[PDB]
């Protein structure tokens, strides 16, 4: 589904300020999609299956082996992210994509058990920490792309004006 970069197009792009790409036949690119659709205290995220489908197909077509995890608490997300960061395939990869799709608030991403009374939140800070040079040395010097579909609060995000 992705428009291809031709050999002359890649030659036009290629000098010393581009991330190096590994050989197609030997590389083991990994990507992870975490999507919460069903919640204990928040309405179902209908349409999330459309999001999972599109993102899975796109990332696969870009050369990534895609793992999909559904309906997890923040603790489960943490465990999954820790396991993902430890994957040996990253050593023979040149990059990674992390996709998060859920309900969200100012503090971060909602786990399936989230409530106003009892918070179940994965902080963006924690995602970076779990994927940093200390906790994920295999992705040192390699681009790590984090995509997050979620509210960052309940404000419509607008101001009104007359003139």
């Amino acid at each position: 589904n992705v428009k291809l970069c031709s050999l002359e197009e890649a030659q036009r792009i290629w000098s010393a300020e581009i991330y190096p790409i590994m050989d197609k036949s030997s590389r083991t690119r990994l990507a992870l999609i975490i999507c919460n659709e069903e919640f204990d205290s928040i309405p179902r995220r209908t349409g999330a299956e459309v999001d999972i489908t599109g993102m899975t197909m796109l990332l696969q077509n870009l050369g990534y082996s895609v793992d999909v995890k559904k309906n997890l608490t923040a603790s489960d997300m943490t465990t999954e992210l820790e396991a993902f960061a430890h994957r040996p395939e990253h050593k023979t990869s040149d990059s990674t994509f992390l996709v998060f799709m859920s309900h969200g608030i100012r503090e971060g991403i909602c786990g399936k058990k989230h409530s106003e009374q009892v918070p179940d939140i994965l902080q963006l800070n924690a995602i970076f920490n779990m994927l940093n040079t200390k906790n994920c040395p295999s992705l040192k010097d390699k681009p790590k792309v984090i995509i997050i579909q979620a509210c960052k609060g309940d404000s419509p995000g607008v101001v009104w004006f007359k003139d």
């Binding site: 589904n1 992705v2 428009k3 291809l4 970069c5 031709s6 197009e9 890649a10 792009i13 300020e17 581009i18 991330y19 790409i21 197609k24 995220r45 209908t46 349409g47 999330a48 459309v50 999001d51 599109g54 993102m55 796109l58 077509n61 870009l62 050369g63 990059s95 799709m101 969200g104 100012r106 963006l124 970076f128 994927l131 940093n132 040079t133 200390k134 992705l139 040192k140 010097d141 390699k142 681009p143 790590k144 792309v145 984090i146 995509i147 997050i148 579909q149 979620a150 509210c151 960052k152 609060g153 309940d154 404000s155 419509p156 995000g157 607008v158």
Partner: protein
């Protein structure tokens, strides 16, 4: 022992600005996700991810209807990330 940056080569792309809502159609899916896929499909061949993400932000420029503004966060990319699709 040798020193390495604790945090480097990250980019985050979020569906809206801090405090603010992101929208999702019950049957057509999340608008940010759909917009991102379409731009990645079109521009991965010719643009680096930072450029693509900027293009995505531009598509939301007009605050028509259910307004939102995707945001790039915590960028420590030291080089351009081209996906070179097909390679």
């Amino acid at each position: 022992i040798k020193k390495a940056h604790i945090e480097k080569d990250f980019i985050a792309f979020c569906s809206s600005t801090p405090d603010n809502v992101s929208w999702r159609h019950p049957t057509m899916g999340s608008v940010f996700i759909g917009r991102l896929i379409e731009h990645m499909q079109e521009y991965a061949c010719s643009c680096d991810v930072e450029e693509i993400f900027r293009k995505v932000r531009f598509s939301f420029e007009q605050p028509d209807g259910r307004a939102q503004m995707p945001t790039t966060e915590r960028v420590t990319l030291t080089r351009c990330f081209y996906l070179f699709p097909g390679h």
